[PDB]
Amino acid sequence: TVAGQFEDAD
Amino acid sequence: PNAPACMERQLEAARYRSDGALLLGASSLSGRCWAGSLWLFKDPCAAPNEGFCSAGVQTEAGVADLTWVGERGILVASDSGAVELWELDENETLIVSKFCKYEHDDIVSTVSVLSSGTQAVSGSKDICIKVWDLAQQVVLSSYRAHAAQVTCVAASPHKDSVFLSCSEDNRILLWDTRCPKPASQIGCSAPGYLPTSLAWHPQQSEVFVFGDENGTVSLVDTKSTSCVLSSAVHSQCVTGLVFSPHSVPFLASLSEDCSLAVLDSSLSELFRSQAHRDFVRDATWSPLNHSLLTTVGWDHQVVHHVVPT
Amino acid sequence: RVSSGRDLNCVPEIADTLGAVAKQGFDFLCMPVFHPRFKREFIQEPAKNRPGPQTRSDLLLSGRDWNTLIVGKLSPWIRPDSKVEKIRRNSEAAMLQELNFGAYLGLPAFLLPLNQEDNTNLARVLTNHIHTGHHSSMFWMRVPLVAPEDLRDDIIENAPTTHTEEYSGEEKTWMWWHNFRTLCDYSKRIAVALEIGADLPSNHVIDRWLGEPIKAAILPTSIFLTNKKGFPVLSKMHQRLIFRLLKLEVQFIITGTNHHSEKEFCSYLQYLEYLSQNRPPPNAYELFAKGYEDYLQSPLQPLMDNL
Amino acid sequence: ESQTYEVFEKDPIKYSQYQQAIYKCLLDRVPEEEKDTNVQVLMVLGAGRGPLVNASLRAAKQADRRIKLYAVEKNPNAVVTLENWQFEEWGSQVTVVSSDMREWVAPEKADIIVSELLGSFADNELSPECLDGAQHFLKDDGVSIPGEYTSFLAPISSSKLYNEVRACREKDRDPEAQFEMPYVVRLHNFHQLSAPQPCFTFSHPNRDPMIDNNRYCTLEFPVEVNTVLHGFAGYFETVLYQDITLSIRPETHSPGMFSWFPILFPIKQPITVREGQTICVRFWRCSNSKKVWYEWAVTAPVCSAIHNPTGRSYTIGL
Amino acid sequence: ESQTYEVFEKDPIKYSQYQQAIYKCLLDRVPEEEKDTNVQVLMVLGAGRGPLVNASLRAAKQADRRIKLYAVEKNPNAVVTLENWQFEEWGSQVTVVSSDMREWVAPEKADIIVSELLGSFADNELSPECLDGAQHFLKDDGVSIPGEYTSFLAPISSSKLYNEVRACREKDRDPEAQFEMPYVVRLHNFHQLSAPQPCFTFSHPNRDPMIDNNRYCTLEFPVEVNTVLHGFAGYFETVLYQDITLSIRPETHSPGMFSWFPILFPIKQPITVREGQTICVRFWRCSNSKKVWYEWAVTAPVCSAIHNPTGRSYTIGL
Amino acid sequence: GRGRGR
Amino acid sequence: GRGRGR
Amino acid sequence: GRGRGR
Ligand SMILES: Nc1ncnc2c1ncn2[C@@H]1O[C@H](C[C@@H](N)CC[C@H](N)C(=O)O)[C@@H](O)[C@H]1O
Ligand SMILES: Nc1ncnc2c1ncn2[C@@H]1O[C@H](C[C@@H](N)CC[C@H](N)C(=O)O)[C@@H](O)[C@H]1O
């Protein structure tokens, strides 16, 4: 749903 | 008292309030619903009749342990891995949930309150101990020093931020959270049998007692060279240990063998009983009469004993 | 889809718990058949005569639901390898009772732990149960990749940890497994359910593990990292391991509590879906070979017989 | 398993007839003048998951006779389900016993004992042994439901059944053991060479000073088809109480009832038969206080080996 | 068979030791001032053909103590010989009973119980079960002969014995079954890797609140040379009464005794061993109220499958 | 096995 | 049987 | 046979 919901943690 | 209709048939915790009121936590370990409940009796004798309970409430899940946070605060450990705090109303007629957190994984096996009274310590079966600030309503700290289930924890009654913890990995650790690497590994130095319960001596500092699987109550000193004196009083594991409020406390021990044993300072069996028909879960000394001991077990009984103190 | 399940040890009521689990998108629930804290005795007179039911009845669920939705767990208090004769005997009796009840319910799988090095008595009891009657319940052994003793923090003053490489010491958990299946004689009804844990071991250890008959993989919710948006995520090594496991068609079991309270628990499962998709799609060879993997077939002999 | 009991409970005819028999027995035993004061002790043996207990309670309610009920069950999981039922619904009226009836010592003498231990063959599941063990705690005037049961045999020809039996070769076993054990089959594709004839009869309670279950029977079956005999199909009938009956025999098959399938006793070698050549067969029911087994052989028209001697290939543990 | 008893009676050492133990117990139990009135009731369980009865009579005669002798036997064929003996020589002094001590009801309590049920492993013949059954008719101050027996194990490597056991490939049976059953064999061509260690121990009479014969043992054997473990030899040592003892353990073998041979517990695959390693093995004695079987597994240096799980291959009929 | 068999 | 098997 | 064997 949210854009970049699954983007890796930095 | 607009309380639950009936209790769960497996009493799990008993605690005497300074005023004399008895808090009794029960859970349903069998049947369709595995729920829990708490009850407060202004008259210990009337218990466990649900009609004479001064107050009562039904918890979300089972109740594994509980403790008095003060004169009206009740801190409870739940099978859902949640630690919760309830508060009595001004009239002490209703138990109202105040706080409830699911920080712990698995099921919280035990809980305790530090001497300061505003902080608590909990141990879970998921290899972890946690220190909470009740006033702040957060988890101050989390530790993983054991390699197996944290069987028991016991706050120091005389020194704040000091508490013992015993696990199934056969380690007894004396945590002093004021310094780095708080765990101290101080113990009997006898890895023979796993510990099962701990108890600080109310009067003597740095001196405590513990129990193992084979029902051997051992008295040890923190500052000593692991020197201990032990007695094989029970034929089964010692589920709990309680010290009397006398100036020379007697040690009350209850075991899986469904028996009670009151021992002197020398661990000599001063009195014994086998009234219960099942596991004895908890015992507590009545503040009004120091010779009266109230014990609760899974047989759904509250047994009052008069000890020859 | 990626078969995913939920691991719970506190189930106040089955109906609502299953409703909530299904709503979150899980496919099966791992639960205790008996209450975890309800100790039971079998050789002590006052205790063995305990009245009343010993557990919730099977009538609560349809026979289909038991056979597909539920996975039994062994009670934590059962320690068949205890040093005390009484405790050992009680643990044996309790484990046998729980396994028999699981068979009675016809559970598809039953989850047992391997948290300690020595498991000879447990293996003996399980083998005895297998060679007794006819039942089809698989057994999943929960074996951490890293032993619990090695994952504890350096908090003890008198028992400090060691930073030695311990190349041979990282395989110990596998040994625990290897012995166990050896004791049970490579029974086809025993499978592994390894627990990922926070930190991964050397890549060779993971490669060795991937050759074992892994059926499930336990993901604690504590290993998921938090991204800048507050959602759970996994590190690169964890992502690679998850890809390799997905290539094996393993069943993922999310365990623990919702650490990312701001979000929903389903957020965890969704992430696995995001990993399920976007993975390298199968090539022509893999698609061709699908359906024939680890399936033994005799070679052709065109000279002797006609194709 | 749970599914076994679940499929058992799908049959309404058996439990309805059990309820009818219990109701009639209660009416007979308790006269109207003693309705308020007389309470009958009823013991349900092998209560399983409790359908028999529910039937007994409904029969007592409709007959308006007071009853006190015991439910004996040896399976611990069925015991768990029964205890949950008792706590939830039945209450103090039903007392659950988790013990084998042969070893249990009852606190009271039962007025009625209701049981269901009838396999495809009448006494396949050792109903006689369990009931004779339970008789010791029955009243001198007590009643046992089912009252009596008989088993029937009928020769059958089935190339398909013989082929499937021959295909039951189990490695790690005597090569010809599959032919020495009975199977329960629907016998959809078969030819019956004669009407079934009674084989064994059992009645309870057994007041005979001799108490033995070993039996020997000989049967003659006229043949009018000149075919090949492949095995023996076994059915059974039972009288629960007076008129109330329950059977699976084709001529008197209970309508709708589907809880049992005919049993099959194979023969090692097919035997050709002619227009005459009455088929003479012999059946033995033997035991040794630790096992029970059946031995059968055909003596006419052409003899055959004795099957399953000394329980060599198939036995039922006591 | 009669030949078995014939070979049994050849050994004089066993019966001489039994007579000595009896004699001593009688002397201890009957003081001189009560010599002519204190008549001790002595029961010989599993009397067999008489040898124990003759030994008891000789011990009583040489001790000058009055005795009253019962001889219990279940084998009817041996009962015939016992009755002939009693009618001919013993007379009314000896009462012969044709029953099983586990079900017989003695008319009165007995001061002493004499039995010779010891097997090669001292429990493979279910001596503990029979003696526990017999204990119900023993006086509170009674004595049991043997009063205690221990069974010892010792690893052994023998290619010849391994090949022999491999050659015991029976038909219509699991090909690996031969490796899951103990064998009693005269160990001649074998190498013993370590000294035997006590495996199991039983004592009678048993007065503890709980009576259970299920046992679990773990043994560690140091090894000082490269070798190939092939099995475990098993011996026993019995303390008949005080110093009077019988043993077949090599370091304390009873001189001249030949009535017992060591038992052999094989393992499926040979286990290579190196000096400095320790062979860790585990033994289980399990019983299900109808059978008694052993289960053994090798845990170190390399694991091996549990042998004979649930008495799959070898069982002793209770 | 629906009916009366395994 | 696919591949080169049976 | 002799000894203690069948
Ligand atoms: N000797 C015995 N003592 C006690 N229960 C027994 C014995 N033999 C069989 N049973 C039980 O009898 C039951 C058989 C019945 N459940 C069969 C279906 C029947 N309609 C019922 O539900 O009662 C099983 O639960 C068996 O465990
Ligand atoms: N449970 C039992 N009840 C009665 N007799 C038994 C039982 N078990 C074994 N026996 C008998 O015990 C005897 C064993 C002895 N004969 C062994 C040799 C011994 N030297 C003797 O001749 O007495 C056999 O005759 C068995 O039939």
Numbering used by the authors:
A (entry chain I): 225 to 234
B (entry chain H): 21 to 329
C (entry chain G): 13 to 319
D (entry chain J), E (entry chain C): 320 to 637
F (entry chain P), G (entry chain O), H (entry chain M): 109 to 114
Please quote the authors directly.
Protein arginine methyltransferase (PRMT) 5 is an essential arginine methyltransferase responsible for the majority of cellular symmetric dimethyl-arginine marks. PRMT5 uses substrate adaptors such as pICln, RIOK1, and COPR5 to recruit and methylate a wide range of substrates. Previous structural analysis revealed that PRMT5 forms a hetero-octamer with its obligate binding partner MEP50/WDR77.
To test this, we reconstituted a PRMT5/WDR77/6S complex as previously described. The 6S is an established structural complex of the Sm proteins comprised of pICln, SmD1, SmD2, SmE, SmF, and SmG, where pICln acts as an assembly chaperone of snRNP assembly. We collected cryo-EM data of this recombinant PRMT5/WDR77/6S complex in presence of the PRMT5 inhibitor sinefungin. We observed clear density for the pICln PBM peptide and SmD1 GRG peptide, in accordance with a recently reported PRMT5/WDR77/U7 6S study. We also observed density for sinefungin. The globular domains of the 6S complex were largely absent from 2D class averages and 3D reconstructions, owing to the flexible linkers attaching the 6S complex to the PBM and GRG peptide motifs. While the position of the PBM peptide on the substrate adaptor/substrate complex is important, it does not lead to a highly structured PRMT5–substrate complex but rather substrate adaptors lead to more efficient recruitment and methylation of the substrate by proximity.
